[PDB]
Design a protein around this ligand. Structure first.
Ligand SMILES: O=C(Nc1cncc2ccccc12)[C@@H]1CCOc2cc(F)c(Cl)cc21
Lengths: 297, 300
């Protein structure tokens, strides 16, 4: 029993965190094989600024060991520093780009040293509601599949509202953001509907049933109400993904939607669900199954 | 900016997780140097759970009864001893991944990260606090026993908790790494009830300071209060008494935000009276009590 916001064990990623220093700027890098990946703003026209840098301008520190940079290239907003040594702690890994609503763990680092790990979702507006201070740039987001680390995020900046923006490991930004000091605003956020439903299933599995009702709804009727309360549209794919939880709890997805529909039109009424007075949307259907079944890494 | 419930990076603890099997029971062990620590109820059978005599059951066991698995490598047990509710299995190999560590007994209100394991394999890391009733509100399934709570400060791992049992209310009970239970609990299937839980007041105040640092000021007011008047109100909302030690601990946050502790105490009093009124504080509609004053300074 119990439901917690749980991150993947960060050990395989801690073995890859290095400190990248270029001029006055010091941020984090991801050392995989003989390449160190980091935000290209560490050099701060990026083609022009990068052509003026040499390999000895980048000071890479893996613990108390300085790595010698033997090459540098740029892939979108990520700088790739070729180093002489392959990271012996390199795990089985993949670079994946996640969709909004998908969750991942963030290993927050300062000066190439991991200081914290937390779970979070890629918001539908492509920002993450992280917790980052100066020096956290280059901190990475990841998921673990069996023994494979899927790197899905690299932190680049903080928007004026306190939310965060970054890229996948191929340097492609999530969202309409640029790695530059200019006026940038995150779009109005929406609630990740499928994740709220997954969290409602997790509450039922934990014995919290007060919100359940006899009612069911059509997907079209639910989406009319979802649009109204700034909730993301629920697709048939989402309904299918919630299938195993629906089978386990015996509550059809559209039956759980009528409960969500009522929770939105009426509220919690002083009650909580899994110790929360708000509807939690940072647990995907897969996260709920993983936590309420005990999958290990 | 931003405030999140943040756990410590679990890497140093993942390198210590092993699977301990004794008879039919399989739980997790903590392998540090040449010793594997695990809950002593790993030696328990079906009719040795309501009233087990652990000294008696342990004397009947031999080193080859304990099957220890560190990854795909079986470790050889060369000794066994019991320290309170923890079983210490001496092994023939020192863990090369043993970090700088200490065994630390924490007080209620203190926070720590939990590395949840099943079969000696870490599956997730989360953050939680030792509740005033000495239970933890974890996320644990069968086989999680022996999962450890820890803090990682300045390269060192302070182990402060080992998971032992789930109480009938879904909350969890365990011990420090010296086998001493937190709370009035025992490792027996007897009827055990957690005392009525209370809110960790100092942690709520620390979280209110964290919100002020993050630009949330809507809950602040022109009022201040006496410590006794705050405790008289707080006790009625099932909040822990705020001691002068707690007031002193909140000092640095009070200096940083320019809001006296007793002034923040009056903001809290008001929040308890009115509720949030559809508003949130750090993205939360409830007052958060699992961030200590030390955590807030750490994160901010
Ligand atoms: O509770 C137990 N460990 C679990 C841990 N965390 C979470 C759980 C969730 C579900 C089922 C077991 C859970 C065991 C087995 C069941 O009974 C006892 C009784 C005892 F006196 C002791 Cl010391 C341990 C246990």
């Amino acid at each position: 029993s119990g439901f917690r916001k749980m991150a993947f064990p960060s050990g395989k990623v801690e073995g890859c965190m290095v400190q990248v220093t270029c001029g006055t700027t010091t941020l984090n890098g991801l050392w995989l094989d003989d390449v160190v990946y980091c935000p290209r703003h560490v050099i701060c026209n990026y083609e022009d600024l990068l052509i003026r840098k040499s390999n000895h301008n980048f000071l890479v520190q893996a613990g108390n060991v300085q790595l010698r940079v033997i090459g540098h290239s740029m892939q979108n907003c990520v700088l790739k520093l070729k180093v002489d040594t392959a990271n012996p702690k390199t795990p089985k890994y993949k670079f994946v780009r996640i969709q909004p609503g998908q969750t991942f763990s963030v290993l927050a680092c300062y000066n190439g040293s991991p200081s914290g790990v937390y779970q979070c979702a890629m918001r539908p507006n492509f920002t993450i509601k992280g917790s980052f201070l100066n020096g956290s740039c280059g901190s990475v987001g990841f998921n673990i599949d069996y023994d494979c680390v899927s790197f899905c995020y690299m932190h680049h900046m903080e928007l004026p509202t306190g939310v965060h923006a970054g890229t996948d490991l191929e340097g492609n930004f999530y969202g309409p953001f640029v790695d530059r000091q200019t006026a940038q605003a995150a779009g109005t956020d929406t609630t990740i509907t499928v994740n709220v439903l997954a969290w409602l299933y997790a509450a039922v599995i934990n014995g919290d049933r007060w919100f359940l009702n006899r009612f069911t709804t059509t997907l079209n009727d639910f989406n009319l109400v979802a649009m109204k309360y700034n909730y993301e549209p629920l697709t048939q794919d989402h309904v299918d993904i919630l299938g195993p939880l629906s089978a386990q709890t015996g509550i059809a997805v559209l039956d759980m939607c009528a409960s969500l529909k009522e929770l939105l039109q009426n509220g919690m009424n002083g009650r909580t669900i899994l110790g929360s007075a708000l509807l939690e949307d940072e647990f995907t259907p897969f996260d709920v199954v993983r936590q309420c079944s005990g999958v290990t890494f």
